[PDB]
Design a protein around this ligand. Sequence first.
Ligand SMILES: CCc1c(-c2cccc(OC)c2)[nH]c(=S)n(C)c1=O
Length: 134
Amino acid sequence: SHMCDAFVGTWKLVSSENFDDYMKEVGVGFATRKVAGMAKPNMIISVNGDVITIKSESTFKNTEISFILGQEFDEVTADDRKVKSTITLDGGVLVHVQKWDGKSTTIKRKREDDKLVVECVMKGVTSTRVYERA
Ligand SMILES: CCc1c(-c2cccc(OC)c2)[nH]c(=S)n(C)c1=O
């Protein structure tokens, strides 16, 4: 076993707060905000050795990232940014930093009771997205 074990599984979005405002701060345009904001993604998290995979599947887009903690990678986001990402584990929280165009956003994923809570921060704007087991 590894501590990342508690993230593994299939998760479904059950609530979202302030996500439109977060998307605006990121620079997402109107039509993508509207359609992306409707989506109810599932997130599939798995681990094989040192490699963590996070798949997100929705009616809007499907995405997949695979990575090693602390090792930067290329990511194309659901809203089509080409970003450089680094994901670390800080005190049991997965911390995902995306950098593009001189900008940065941080996505934190944590287990809280039976939920997986996702906090997305762009400058002063935070969105909270709650997932439960599928
Ligand atoms: C903008 C991408 C994004 C989504 C998301 C939103 C809509 C559809 C979708 O399809 C896979 C994914 N969800 C969360 S929780 N975070 C942290 C994101 O960065």
